[PDB]
Design a protein around this ligand. Structure first.
Ligand SMILES: CCCCCCCCCCCCCCCCCC(=O)OC[C@H](COP(=O)([O-])OCC(O)COP(=O)([O-])OC[C@@H](COC(=O)CCCCCCCCCCCCCCCCC)OC(=O)CCCCCCCCCCCCCCCCC)OC(=O)CCCCCCCCCCCCCCCCC
Ligand SMILES: CCCCCCCCCCCCCCCCCC(=O)OC[C@H](COP(=O)([O-])OCC(O)COP(=O)([O-])OC[C@@H](COC(=O)CCCCCCCCCCCCCCCCC)OC(=O)CCCCCCCCCCCCCCCCC)OC(=O)CCCCCCCCCCCCCCCCC
Ligand SMILES: CCCCCCCCCCCCCCCCCC(=O)OC[C@H](COP(=O)([O-])OCC[N+](C)(C)C)OC(=O)CCCCCCCCCCCCCCCCC
Ligand SMILES: CCCCCCCCCCCCCCCCCC(=O)OC[C@H](COP(=O)(O)OCCN)OC(=O)CCCCCCCCCCCCCCCCC
Ligand SMILES: CCCCCCCCCCCCCCCCCC(=O)OC[C@H](COP(=O)(O)OCCN)OC(=O)CCCCCCCCCCCCCCCCC
Ligand SMILES: CCCCCCCCCCCCCCCCCC(=O)OC[C@H](COP(=O)(O)OCCN)OC(=O)CCCCCCCCCCCCCCCCC
Ligand SMILES: CCCCCCCCCCCCCCCCCC(=O)OC[C@H](COP(=O)(O)OCCN)OC(=O)CCCCCCCCCCCCCCCCC
Ligand SMILES: CCCCCCCCCCCCCCCCCC(=O)OC[C@H](COP(=O)(O)OCCN)OC(=O)CCCCCCCCCCCCCCCCC
Ligand SMILES: CCCCCCCCCCCCCCCCCC(=O)OC[C@H](COP(=O)(O)OCCN)OC(=O)CCCCCCCCCCCCCCCCC
Ligand SMILES: CCCCCCCCCCCC(=O)OC[C@H](COP(=O)(O)OCC[N+](C)(C)C)OC(=O)CCCCCCCCCCC
Lengths: 83, 115, 96, 171, 51, 175, 99, 347, 98
């Protein structure tokens, strides 16, 4: 822990630009794997309706599919309105 | 239509200014006046002789790195995908390899101009 | 601040896209009639222009299938004036 | 080969909805909540039939329901709606953000005089189910009969008869 | 099979290395002054430049 | 007419090619390839790809800027050749334009021409699609899929560019 | 492929971009999606020798959609005939075809 | 060159070839060739002398032109079929360009002028890659597009290759130029049987690689690059001259050696397809190859050419060259005819 | 096959004929290789953009990436040719005889 601290001080004294570069890049690779908010970025992208939501023909056996847009069934974006 | 008319106007104004420059003034042309400029003494050789490029290696590397901007510029659109884990992995992989290329040339004295 | 405002911007985008999704059934219905009306007008005019050609069959399909094939720009605006053809082809790309 | 069949101009005649894009966008959220069934019926027909000629009748009920929707706004909410879509019409991008105060006045009139509740965020993008008596198309692509597959080769795998039979080789 | 065309052909070097060509480096000669801002007015510095 | 803008740009595209294909001084050849790159961007940009058109122009503007520096160092002579100074250069330049003229002359007169393939002279606008897209650019959505769909393409191109830097240093080392 | 490492390993390296009727971003369809699908489904598992003759109808429609050779010839004849009639004052264009 | 960089560049050459063999998409096939050319050239420039610079430049110019024609074929094939799959091409013009692009890469006649010169200008080890490994990728593509290849075009290139390769090899005293013209002639046999039975193309390629790799390994052991340099081998390594004799006789197609198998199987497939005039012409023209292999045996093993005094100093040192797989390759290149029915594993 | 494809395919043929007829400069021939890549890029982009082949839209970009590698590689060889003879003339590249 003494010899490694010598290396860090030496580079911090001679290549401060590179020390900042590697430190910045290290955070880019590490933080996403740890942030609890990374999963919401995936959900927001999936929740953006670029295409038309083509309706499903009702065969009478689709209880989890809403009949009207304002029905309780179907995915909800309540989480997004608070995120 | 608008863009083309905007371009025509800009280069028409530029052209008309040049035309006025050559036809409005009084001219007195003779040989010594139009000789090449070399601080007062006649140039010793032709300006068309070879001119060594000491940063030739860095210029070739610019061709390879200038193609990374083509691959990197789609990132704002790439971030809109539902495959963020894959997209972020390949975005960082592509940038990192671009950095390893810089590190290799830097360490091998590739960015130093030839003597 | 930047990530809080961008998050609000994503919700304003979903609202904007849902406005389109509410209108698309009306826009699609209008577009279908508009395309069919134009094709018929070309068919009523191909008959008069091509009445004397020996082997011509008015309205013949170039395809073996009887499936609906989306008309391309030439078929839809084959005989119309160049002014409307110019806007239907390069109108979007040129609108700046 | 064959003649392309087209509807007559009388089959395509219908009362158009002559309102600008700013009018439609101002009423889109309420329009998609009230006129859902005829809309989703027509939109199921297009994706199943894949032919605009097979959904003209459904396409007219979209127009009929949109007109009745605006007639109800014209009877009760005429003034608040006009202010709302005038302010949306002003922006180049027709942004909703810049007309919240005018949107509130339009939303409260319909809520009281018509009972219309604005859909929440994400409601109109839901995939919904529609009941229809129109039969499911059987051959929407007008495909021919697929060629018969090659006779499959199956059975016990015995050793090569007399080996490779390559010239003078015994094995 | 010798012919007239291949009469002046000679076998390549035993190690594939041809002699380097006679030095033809063409340095660029430039008058740096006298009429030059950094020449202090009356200096004619004739410089051989490579790049 | 502006309905033939794509065709008119493609004629300049060929003329630029005859500019550097006749091979004058690479200084003037580089200019010819810039003109072709500029009009080539225009042609692609009129088919719905703005990123592709602007990108190829951007890449070739930097490509010919390095070529320009290499021309003043290693591809220069006392009298750089222009399209008129040499019979071989002039001969190939006039020949290229004449063939372009005849092809352009026949296609606009007969509305057809048969050279290897069969070409149609009605106009490029007759093949465009009559339907609109949604709220996105199809070209932009396809290019942005390189990172979600093109995982294998990103690896090979990324490795190729890396090795490209290693190779050029090896070739130019000289020892 | 000469060596089919993809198929055995179950990894999709480049098959996702081989045809235009495959899955696309945001389910954006190609202009000739139906024609390509029909030709691909007709000629599946029967070899190219048979498909070259038994799925000739689908492949000719597919090529018609791709390059529109027959449609442009048909448009050329109608346009050419209309000019001949107009050049000799024998046909009056309608208003909706002029303005 | 740094040993680690040499290894990395070597693996990049293989990766390019492997990408071509596993690719089912045309774009990836093109990427494979581009990666292969990018990595091969630095191995040609390794010794950094003017002849190696010329060889690399001629190689780059030829390969770059071929890759342009191959991309033109892919795009034309895209316009007429709307798909990128690596299978039979759907346009005759696309087939001709792709066939010619693959002919330029292989060095078939009349696109052969670079092969004799590039091989002469690079070391023996680099030449071995050029004439053995660089043939795998183009042959991989021909194997998959042969149904659409014009029969006249492919058979014309094969016949010209067998003729030019045989004639060109007669007027040569440089071993690298002898091996170069021998390679062109053997390409003809591979592509002549391609329309009839692609399996026999693989057999001839495998046997050609083994024999060719054996010759370069033995030339590499003694650092011999000329006929006369090889003529001193009997006075240093007598065993090596016997192995050269057996391998050269095998390359000439003489039974009972291994190299007779590819000719024997290629004649069988062509005669089954009622092709009689061509196999007979090909076999007879191949006697040109056997003549300048016999001329190498005469000056190498069957006679004893004059020596030089300093040769006595070389008797006191062993061979330190690696000579990897040479004992195995020489046996496979001479005694495999009894195992000929094993060609079925290639199917 | 519209009238635009004629000019684009003619551009490729002009650059191909330009590449196969050397005058003196190796740099003049390198420009013809970069010219051919430009034609292929335009021809591929047109076909892909017109057919709404969404995923193929990245192919033209991947075509430019490997055109730069070749262009850079060709320039690197041109440096070494120039360093050996003082010019980029192709007639000096004749030490090796066929
Ligand atoms: C056994 C089974 C037999 C089966 C028979 C069937 C036929 C197959 C056998 C073919 C025979 C091949 C071997 C020929 C003899 C090699 C020549 C020799 O003796 O070495 C001297 C010679 C070097 O001597 P030098 O010139 O004095 O010094 C060179 C440097 O300057 C020196 O600089 P340095 O001092 O810094 O050192 C550099 C470093 C460099 O070290 C190396 O050489 C290692 C090279 C990398 C090989 C890695 C193994 C491959 C597998 C790796 C796994 C991943 C592969 C995929 C990669 C992509 C994925 C990321 O060290 C060396 O040079 C080591 C000496 C060379 C030993 C080579 C041993 C490997 C060759 C055999 C395997 C074949 C590899 C594929 C060919 C590569 C094509 C480019 O070796 C070579 O350079 C030639 C390399 C081989 C090229 C020809 C290979 C044959 C191509 C045909 C393909 C055959 C297979 C497919 C068809 C047949 C099967 C159906
Ligand atoms: C899976 C089944 C694979 C069956 C092959 C297993 C043995 C191959 C590995 C042995 C080896 O090191 O040779 C590779 C290879 C041998 O090349 P080499 O230098 O020419 O071998 C002769 C030396 O004098 C070798 O002499 P050394 O003193 O330098 O080393 C003695 C060597 C002695 O190893 C040997 O016996 C060399 C011969 C074994 C390889 C034979 C080629 C592979 C056999 C299949 C090809 C024939 C196909 C069948 C016939 C045609 C169709 C029926 O014993 C070992 O090194 C034991 C290594 C155990 C791991 O060494 C390498 O550089 C690559 C590693
Ligand atoms: C279109 C061409 C635009 C570029 C014109 C550039 C230019 O004008 O340079 C003058 C160049 C340089 O010529 P010059 O340098 O020999 O001298 C110009 C003036 N005289 C000849 C009178 C001494 O000359 C031209 O090419 C002029 C072309 C005619 C432009 C129209 C002239 C109208 C005058 C009123
Ligand atoms: C999971 C995916 C992410 C990981 C990707 C893997 C690749 C990582 C590397 C990508 C960037 C490429 C450059 C990496 C090499 C660093 C540059 C280098 O080669 O340095 C060599 C250096 C030469 O310099 P020299 O002439 O010898 O003089 C100084 C001597 N001390 O000689 C030296 O002395 C260097 C001494 C060693 C330097 C170590 C550098 C490590 C860099 C990575 C650190 C990242 C973590 C730091 C941040 C933590 C988070 C905040
Ligand atoms: C020069 C460039 C480099 C500069 C240095 C980089 C900065 C220092 C590195 C640490 C900080 C990185 C994150 C950057 C700031 C994140 C945004 C922020 O700070 O705001 C806090 C925000 C509050 O929550 P929010 O929901 O937005 O509340 C209002 C919503 N309307 O919070 C959020 O909304 C999101 C919460 C996640 C925050 C990300 C960090 C957590 C990562 C997991 C824990 C690991 C921490 C690192 C420890 C391991 C590494 C050593
Ligand atoms: C992450 C990669 C980590 C490797 C280092 C990357 C940064 C480059 C540093 C180069 C300078 C250095 O410090 O290392 C030099 C290295 C060791 O050799 P040495 O003899 O000690 O000194 C140089 C003598 N010329 O000399 C070398 O041999 C350099 C070898 C590396 C050459 C570049 C290739 C890097 C490996 C790829 C890393 C990315 C993974 C890509 C995977 C995709 C595969 C398809
Ligand atoms: C139809 C395609 C052919 C069109 C004609 C193209 C030839 C145009 C004339 C030409 O290129 O020049 C004639 C050429 C000699 O030109 P030149 O460079 O002056 O040779 C002596 C230089 N010291 O001599 C030739 O090689 C012309 C060959 C024809
Ligand atoms: C005058 C040129 C000419 O007419 O030559 C045509 C000649 C024969 O080809 P073809 O037209 O198919 O046969 C006659 C069919 N009526 O074919 C030719 O000789 C034309 C030479 C074409 C050279 C092609 C070089 C390879 C590039 C191929 C890409 C496709 C180029 C063809 C389309 C461009 C047409 C301008
Ligand atoms: C239908 C579709 C047509 C497609 C083809 C269009 C081609 C039109 C011409 C534009 C392309 C120009 C090609 C480049 C020609 C060239 O670079 O010539 C080089 C050659 C060398 O000449 P040089 O070194 O200067 O010495 C004097 C010798 N006379 O100079 C010469 O030796 C003579 C130059 C003659 C140039 C005429 C080339 C046209 C014929 C080419 C074959 C056509 C196919
Ligand atoms: C160095 C030059 C190389 C040769 C270039 C061609 C010159 C000869 C053209 C004669 C053909 C002709 O009679 O057609 C003339 C056309 C006019 O344009 P259009 O849109 O077809 O209008 C005609 C069709 N209308 C009536 C429907 C609108 O010209 C061109 O479009 C040529 C391309 C532009 C020139 C290059 C800039």
């Amino acid at each position: 822990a003494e010899r490694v601290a010598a290396f860090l001080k030496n580079v911090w004294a001679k290549e401060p630009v590179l020390v900042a570069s590697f430190a910045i890049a290290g955070l880019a690779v590490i933080l996403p794997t740890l942030s609890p908010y990374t999963k919401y970025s995936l959900m927001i992208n999936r929740a953006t309706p670029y295409n038309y939501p083509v309706p499903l023909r009702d065969d009478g056996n689709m209880p989890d599919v809403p009949s009207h847009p304002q029905d309780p069934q179907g995915p909800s974006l309540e989480w997004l309105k608070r995120l | 239509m608008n863009l083309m008319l905007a371009l025509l106007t800009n280069f028409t104004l530029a052209t008309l200014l040049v035309i006025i420059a050559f036809w409005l003034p009084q001219l007195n042309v003779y040989s010594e006046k139009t000789s090449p400029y070399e601080c007062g003494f006649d140039p010793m050789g032709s300006a068309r002789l070879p001119f060594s490029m000491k940063f030739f290696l860095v210029a070739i590397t610019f061709l390879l790195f200038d193609l990374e901007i083509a691959l990197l510029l789609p990132l704002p659109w790439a971030s809109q995908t539902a495959n963020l884990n894959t997209m972020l992995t390949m975005a960082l992989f592509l940038i990192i390899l671009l950095a390893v290329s810089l590190a290799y040339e830097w360490t091998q004295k590739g960015l130093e101009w030839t003597e | 601040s930047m990530m809080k405002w961008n998050r609000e911007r994503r919700r304003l985008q979903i609202e904007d896209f849902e406005a389109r999704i509410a209108l698309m059934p009306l826009l699609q219905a209008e577009k279908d009639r508009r395309v069919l009306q134009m094709l018929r007008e070309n068919l009523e005019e191909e008959a008069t222009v091509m009445k004397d050609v020996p082997g011509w069959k008015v309205g013949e399909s170039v395809f073996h299938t009887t499936r609906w094939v989306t008309p391309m720009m030439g078929e839809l605006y084959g005989l119309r004036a160049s002014e409307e053809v110019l806007s239907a082809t390069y109108g979007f790309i040129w609108y700046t | 080969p064959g003649i392309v069949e087209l509807p007559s101009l009388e089959d395509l005649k219908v009362q158009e909805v002559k309102v600008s894009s700013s009018v439609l966008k101002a009423a889109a959220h309420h329009y998609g909540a009230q006129c859902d069934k005829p809309n989703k019926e027509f939109m199921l027909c297009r994706w199943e039939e894949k032919d605009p000629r097979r959904c003209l009748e459904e396409g007219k009920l979209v127009n009929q329901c949109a007109l009745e929707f605006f007639r109800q706004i014209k009877r009760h909410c005429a003034e608040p709606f006009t202010e709302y879509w005038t302010c949306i019409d002003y922006s180049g991008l027709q942004l909703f953000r810049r007309c919240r105060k005018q949107q509130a006045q339009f939303d409260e009139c319909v809520l009281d005089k018509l009972g219309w509740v604005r859909p929440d965020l994400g409601d109109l993008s839901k995939v919904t189910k529609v009941k229809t008596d129109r039969p499911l198309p059987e051959n929407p692509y007008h495909s021919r009969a697929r060629p018969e597959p090659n006779p499959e080769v199956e059975g016990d795998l015995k050793p090569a008869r007399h080996g490779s039979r390559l010239f003078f080789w015994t094995m | 099979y010798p012919t007239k065309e291949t009469a002046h052909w000679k076998p390549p070097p035993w190690n594939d290395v041809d002699p380097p060509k006679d030095t033809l480096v063409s340095n660029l000669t430039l008058n740096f002054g006298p009429q030059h801002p950094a020449a202090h007015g009356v200096l004619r510095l004739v410089m051989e430049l490579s790049g | 007419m502006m309905l033939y803008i794509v065709f008119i740009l493609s004629v300049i595209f060929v003329m630029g090619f005859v500019g550097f294909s006749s091979k004058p001084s690479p200084i003037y050849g580089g200019l010819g390839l810039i003109v072709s790159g500029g009009v080539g961007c225009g042609i692609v940009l009129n088919f719905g790809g703005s990123f592709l058109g602007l990108m190829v122009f951007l890449i070739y503007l930097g490509g010919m800027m390095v070529v320009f520096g290499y021309t003043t160092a290693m591809a220069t002579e006392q009298y750089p050749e222009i399209w008129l100074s040499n019979k071989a250069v002039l001969g190939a330049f006039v020949t290229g334009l004449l063939m372009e003229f005849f092809m352009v002359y026949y296609v606009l007169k007969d509305k057809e021409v048969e050279v290897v393939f069969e070409f149609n002279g009605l106009g490029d606008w007759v093949i465009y699609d009559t339907g609109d897209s949604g709220f996105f650019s199809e070209e932009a959505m396809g290019i942005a899929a390189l990172y979600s769909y093109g995982t294998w393409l990103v690896i090979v191109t990324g490795w190729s560019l890396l090795i490209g830097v290693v190779v050029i240093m090896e070739i130019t080392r000289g020892n | 492929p000469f060596f089919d490492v993809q198929k055995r390993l179950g990894v999709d390296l480049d098959r996702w971009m081989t045809i235009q009727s495959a899955e696309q971003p945001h389910k954006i369809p190609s202009r000739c999606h139906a024609f390509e699908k029909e030709w691909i489904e007709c000629a599946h598992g029967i070899g190219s020798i048979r498909a070259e003759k038994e799925c000739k109808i689908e492949f000719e429609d597919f090529r018609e959609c791709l390059l529109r050779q027959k449609t442009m010839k048909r448009l050329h004849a109608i346009r050419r005939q209309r000019e001949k009639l107009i050049k000799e004052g024998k046909y009056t264009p309608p208003p909706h075809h002029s303005g | 060159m740094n040993p680690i960089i040499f290894i990395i560049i070597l693996l990049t050459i293989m990766l390019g070839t492997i990408i071509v063999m596993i690719s089912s998409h045309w774009l990836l096939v093109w990427i494979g060739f581009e990666m292969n050319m990018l990595a091969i050239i630095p191995i040609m420039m390794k010794n950094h002398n003017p002849r190696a610079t010329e060889a690399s430049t001629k190689y780059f110019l030829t390969q770059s032109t071929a890759s342009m024609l191959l991309m033109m074929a892919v795009i034309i094939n895209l316009m007429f079929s709307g798909q990128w799959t690596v299978m039979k091409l759907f346009n005759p013009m696309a087939s001709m360009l792709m066939t010619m692009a693959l002919a330029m890469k292989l060095g078939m006649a009349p696109f052969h002028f670079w092969v004799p010169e590039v091989t002469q200008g690079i070391p023996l080890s680099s030449g071995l890659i050029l004439l053995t490994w660089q043939k795998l990728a183009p042959m991989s593509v021909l194997y998959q597009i042969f149904p659409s290849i014009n029969l006249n075009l492919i058979l014309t290139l094969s016949v010209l290759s067998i003729l030019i390769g045989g004639w060109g090899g007669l007027n040569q005293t440089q071993l690298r130029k002898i091996m170069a013209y021998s390679s062109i002639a053997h390409m003809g046999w591979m592509t002549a049987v391609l329309p009839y039975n692609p399996t026999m193309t693989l057999l001839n390629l495998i046997i050609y690689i083994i024999m060719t790799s054996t010759m370069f390994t033995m030339f590499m052991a003694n650092s011999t690059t000329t006929t006369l340099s090889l003529s001193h081998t009997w006075n240093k390594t007598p065993i090596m001259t016997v192995l050269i004799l057996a391998t050269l006789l095998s390359m000439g197609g003489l039974p009972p050696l291994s190299g007779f198998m590819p000719k024997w199987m290629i004649i069988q497939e062509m005669t089954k397809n009622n092709s009689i005039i061509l196999p007979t012409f090909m076999a007879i023209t191949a006697l040109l190859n056997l003549y300048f292999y016999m001329r190498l045996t005469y000056s190498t093993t069957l006679t004893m050419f004059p020596s030089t005094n300093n040769m006595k100093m070389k008797w006191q040192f062993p061979l330190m060259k690696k000579m990897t797989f040479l004992p195995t390759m020489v046996v496979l290149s001479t005694m495999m005819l009894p195992l000929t029915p094993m060609l079925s594993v290639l199917e | 096959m519209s009238m635009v494809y004629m000019n684009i395919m003619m551009a490729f043929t002009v650059s191909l004929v330009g590449l196969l007829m050397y005058r003196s400069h190796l740099m003049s021939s390198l420009l013809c290789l970069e010219g051919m890549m430009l034609s292929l890029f335009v021809m591929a982009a047109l076909t892909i953009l017109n057919s709404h082949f969404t995923l193929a839209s990245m192919m033209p970009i991947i075509l430019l990436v490997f055109a730069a590698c070749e262009a850079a590689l060709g320039l690197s060889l041109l440096v070494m040719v120039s360093n050996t003879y003082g010019t980029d003339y192709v007639q000096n590249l004749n030490l090796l005889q066929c």
